[PDB]
Design a protein around this ligand. Structure first.
Ligand SMILES: CCOC(=O)CNC(=O)c1csc(C)c1
Ligand SMILES: CCOC(=O)CNC(=O)c1csc(C)c1
Ligand code: NA
Ligand code: NA
Lengths: 169, 169
């Protein structure tokens, strides 16, 4: 089932979500399937559970094919994500958010991370990630601690409506 | 004539506008009349010339009657505005912007200012202003130096879509 995505301004996006504790359950599997369905209908590249007003440490992300420079990111559902930078190096790049429709900004992120957590069937996931793959997971992780991209913008010249911006990163 | 209001992302909002040098002219008077007409159709409380893609130090503002707590602000067209705080005191309050439709945030502004400049007929204007009157003029003045309200937000919990926010200032 497609779920409504809540918009910035909704206090439910500002919460610190608790951990997932029903790994392997039918209920988590249904939630995850809704999330992938919801992300897909919205043409997203990542979606975090608080964006459908579900207070849990859970995100889905990935796509084959709008982010032209971005290589494929495997379709992944990750519960209880933890992230650690693997270098100090920051890289700037474009982000939008389905809870902030119409807009985008340049945001600095760590270029190189490791992330760890669990797949919905309860098996561990741990991966080193870089570039857009890494950015997507850091952006979704922010949602789980009640953070959205605008509080991360450094250059406000790059923040604007997607159909109007001509900032050349 | 109603002019298109350009949206955030348009580089023309990021310019430092030059001064008005045609005080008393038919051309300025027509521009000002368009501005008041444009602001009115959009139900604004202030509009700055760069928001209609006119690179000039010029703003219109004021209204009898959406900002419930706000008393009447006289209808005013101000060219070559200069602003000086009359106290260090900051006050938080809600702002939106016609170049950023759908959104609003809490923004700190000086509670008490003086502003000076010229009416379109070339006579001097100078006024002490406080509260919402003061805020409106500071917000429009920012447009003349290529600044929009998001680069002034301190509390990102208060930034969101007008139909969704339940932040209680
Ligand atoms: C209609 C398509 O909109 C979008 O996908 C806008 N961008 C995102 O939602 C996004 C999530 S993580 C990240 C790095 C970007
Ligand atoms: C549709 C009505 O929208 C608005 O008026 C949104 N707020 C403004 O544009 C504004 C200009 S100065 C200031 C303090 C607020
Ligand atoms: Na919070
Ligand atoms: Na600028």
């Amino acid at each position: 089932m497609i779920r409504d995505i809540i918009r910035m301004g909704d206090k439910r996006l500002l919460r610190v979500a608790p951990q997932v504790t029903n790994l392997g359950s039918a209920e988590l599997h249904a939630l995850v399937s809704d999330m992938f369905e919801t992300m897909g209908a919205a043409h997203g590249v990542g979606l975090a559970a608080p964006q459908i007003a579900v207070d849990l440490q859970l995100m889905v992300f990935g796509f084959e094919a709008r982010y032209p420079e971005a290589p494929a990111v495997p379709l992944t559902a990750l519960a209880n994500a933890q992230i650690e930078p693997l270098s100090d190096e920051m890289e700037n790049g474009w982000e939008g958010c389905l809870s902030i429709p119409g807009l985008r900004a340049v945001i600095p992120r760590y270029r190189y991370i490791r992330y760890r957590g669990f797949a919905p069937d309860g098996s561990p996931i741990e991966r080193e990630a870089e570039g857009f793959h890494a950015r997507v997971v850091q952006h979704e992780y922010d949602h789980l601690v009640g953070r959205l991209y605008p509080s991360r913008i450094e250059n406000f010249d790059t923040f604007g409506f997607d159909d109007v911006l001509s900032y050349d990163l």
